[PDB]
Design an enzyme around this catalytic site. Structure first.
Site, PDB file in Angstrom:
ATOM      1  CG  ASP A  81      -1.860   1.176   1.310  1.00  0.00           C
ATOM      2  OD1 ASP A  81      -1.945   1.935   0.340  1.00  0.00           O
ATOM      3  OD2 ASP A  81      -2.522   1.355   2.358  1.00  0.00           O
ATOM      4  CB  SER A 138      -1.905  14.315 -13.474  1.00  0.00           C
ATOM      5  OG  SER A 138      -2.297  14.090 -14.823  1.00  0.00           O
TER       6      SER A 138
END
Ligand SMILES: O[C@H]1[C@H](NCc2cnc3ccccc3c2)[C@H]2CO[C@H](O2)[C@@H]1N1CCOCC1
Ligand SMILES: O[C@H]1[C@H](NCc2cnc3ccccc3c2)[C@H]2CO[C@H](O2)[C@@H]1N1CCOCC1
Length: 330
Positions: free
Chosen positions: A35, A199
């Site tokens: 994770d 992004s």
């Protein structure tokens, strides 16, 4: 040193991925959910409430000659889906794919919530976010990667998650045969303890690319792709019959619909998520309404590039002095 292990989807929908991990002496192998959005290594154990164990493999510290109870230390974690777990702490030897760390904090669960109990294939979590997020009290502990880093050939790990297929976590090296083209690296902020990056934008299907900054986290422990409501609305508008269902808790779509791809930007580079990666199947057995794999991040408060996104790429988690993230097509 290096390590390499295979990671496997837990079910036919790629709902999560498990990776075998050796703990203790003699080794006790547990299948853990790696994770990159949390920083605790915790396991189902001989100490977990019996009614809360249902099929998992357990760590029994009393059978490990290298286990040492960390006196007075406890841990408690909650995750974004309302799930939680807590317990005490041992240090023990932990190995992943041939890479060994001695004195790793292994958080033994006394309690876990129902979602964990109900997933028989996941024996615990191995956190790979920054150690600043580790919950051990009164003394915080380091992640497996942090502990291994100085010994690694290069201070990196990579995630190569498969779509309905096997994949690989590598530590200490970049497998240059595992991707096409180049790896584009992008800046990371560790200010929230995550592999957080920005992004450069998105496209839906064959549509034009929209340049817009989307701050989010690279999170192998989140199944879906969580993006701003505006972006998600633009995606689902291209799927006939799709709608956001309050009752179901997000966008659903007719199972026979053709899903468009979704592209996200990494600098000037582009990662294309095929449409079928976004199909999470019937909302309940036998239904012709299907759950979508791109959902709004409005409720969660942070954008999450979860497995839907990451499995479309070869992803480098670069733990140099100034960490960065790398993405390549594959
Ligand atoms: O088959 C390619 C793999 N494809 C994805 C993958 C990842 N993980 C997997 C794990 C298990 C079984 C299969 C796996 C497959 C990746 C990881 O290594 C390379 O790219 C490998 N070859 C590339 C060409 O020369 C080298 C070999
Ligand atoms: O994907 C979620 C994670 N659980 C994955 C999971 C595991 N096992 C599953 C098994 C079956 C079906 C689905 C499953 C899903 C945990 C860790 O963080 C959150 O909860 C995360 N998101 C929840 C929704 O918004 C916040 C981020």
């Amino acid at each position: 040193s290096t390590g390499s292990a295979t990671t496997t989807p837990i079910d036919s929908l790629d709902d999560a991925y498990i990776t075998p991990v050796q703990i203790g002496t003699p080794a006790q192998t547990l299948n853990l959910d790696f994770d990159t959005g949390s920083s605790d290594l915790w396991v189902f154990s001989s100490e977990t409430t019996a009614s809360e164990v249902d099929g998992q493999t357990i760590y029994t510290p009393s059978k490990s000659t290298t286990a040492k109870l960390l006196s007075g230390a406890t841990w408690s974690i909650s995750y974004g889906d309302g799930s939680s777990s807590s317990g005490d702490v041992y240090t023990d030897t932990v190995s992943v794919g041939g890479l060994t760390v001695t004195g790793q904090a292994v958080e033994s669960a006394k309690k876990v919530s129902s979602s964990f109990t109900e997933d028989s294939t996941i024996d615990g979590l191995l956190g790979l976010a920054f150690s600043t997020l580790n919950t051990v009290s009164p003394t915080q502990q380091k992640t497996f990667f942090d502990n291994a880093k100085a010994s690694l050939d290069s201070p990196v790990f990579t995630a190569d998650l498969g779509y309905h297929a096997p994949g690989t976590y590598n530590f200490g090296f970049i497998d240059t045969t595992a991707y096409t083209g180049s790896i584009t690296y992008t800046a990371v902020s560790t200010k929230q303890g995550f592999w957080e990056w920005t992004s450069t934008g998105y496209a839906v299907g064959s549509g034009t690319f929209k340049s817009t900054s989307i701050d989010g986290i690279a999170d192998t422990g989140t199944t879906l792709l969580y993006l701003p409501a505006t972006v998600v609305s633009a995606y689902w508008a291209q799927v006939s019959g799709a709608k956001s269902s309050s009752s179901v808790g997000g966008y659903v779509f007719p199972c026979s619909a053709t899903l468009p791809s979704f592209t996200f930007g990494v600098g000037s580079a582009r990662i294309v998520i095929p449409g079928d990666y976004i199909d999470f199947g019937p909302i309940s057995t036998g239904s012709s309404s299907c759950f979508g794999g791109i959902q709004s991040s409005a409720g969660i408060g942070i954008n999450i590039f979860g497995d839907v996104a990451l499995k479309a790429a070869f992803v480098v988690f670069n733990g140099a002095t100034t960490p960065t993230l790398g993405f390549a097509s594959k």
